[model samples]
Target: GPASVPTTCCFNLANRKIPLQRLESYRRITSGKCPQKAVIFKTKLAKDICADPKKKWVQDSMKYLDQKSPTPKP
Candidate 1:
């Protein structure tokens, strides 16, 4: 698989962008304690830890996540 870069490493909640610098802090909180309306992890580890089973995520955010095709046929 091609190595890809993440464009963001934060969660979106109430239209707010919260940086995940304190990753461990999030996991320490009890379930349903995370106030974020939606979670968005740009990486696998981030997703596993930051994402909660009880919380909802921005499912539609993948619309623009598709990588750009190798330059146009021009």
Candidate 2:
């Protein structure tokens, strides 16, 4: 099957910072047809949260998650 494009776009971003322990993973959403670039943080509670990409907390959270679960090299 062909790769499916994401239809869900962030219209409103969360202003408050989520606890590091609560976050499990994240996805960076590019601004193509969408209004703005966003970072979708997945919580341990199985919730997806939309956040601003330029925020310091968001950047830190990304780094934390990356280091916590790094991609294995072949």
Candidate 3:
């Protein structure tokens, strides 16, 4: 199937957002004001709305994000 296939799920980010480490920071930063627990839980809500799979693009971007400019969970 050589059709121009595309997908938009950020499976890896989907994976990252659920880690307890991330959750812990979120909890601390939010001071329980925001349910960061829910933020991490809901990143998936936009997964399918991304531009396209573009694995290389996302992988690099995710790595950069992980290393440098990670968004605050709070």
Candidate 4:
């Protein structure tokens, strides 16, 4: 299917304004972690990992973490 999006005259991330050099480095570094650390972030892995029967991360943290413990005022 053809993209129905209206073609605008102005360029987006395509114009010379975008620093191509920065994109290259950013893409390389991000690609390295995009598969592992990135997917976990999307699936809310923290909650799921804690829910695991073998290890209850949430419970452990709650037991050790103080509730509503505010940092001391500077």
Top lDDT hit: 2
Show the colliding residue pairs in model 4: none
Backbone collision tally, model 3: 0
In Å, residue 6's CA in model 3 sits off its true spot by: 18
Candidate 1, 1-74: lDDT as tens digits: 11135323324232333343422222223346444433433534444323423332322222222222233343
Task: Indicate the residue-level lDDT of 45 in model 2.
Answer: 86
Candidates sorted by lDDT, descending order? 2, 1, 3, 4
Query: Runs in model 3 with CA error above 4 Å?
Result: 1-54, 70-73
Which lDDT tens digits does candidate 2 get at residues 28-70? 7785777667778888887887777678888888878878875
> Per-residue lDDT for 33-62 in model 4, tens only?
232221110012222110211224322333
**lDDT, model 4:** 0.21
* lDDT on C-alpha atoms for all candidate structures: 0.32, 0.75, 0.29, 0.21
Assess candidate 1 and give its TM-score to the true structure: 0.19
lDDT of 3 by residue, 1-74 (tens): 11124322222223332332232211112244432311112122232212122345334444444565456653
Task: Look at candidate 2 and tell me the lDDT of residue 19.
Answer: 84
Off by over 4 Å in 2: 1-7, 31-33, 72-74
Error of 1 at 21 (Å): 23
* TM-score of each candidate structure, all chains considered together: 0.19, 0.73, 0.26, 0.16
The better candidate by TM-score, 2 or 3, is 2
Residue-pair clashes per prediction, in order, are: 0, 0, 0, 0
Best by TM-score: 2
Model 2 CA lDDT for position 70: 58
What is the full ranking by TM-score, best candidate first?
2, 3, 1, 4
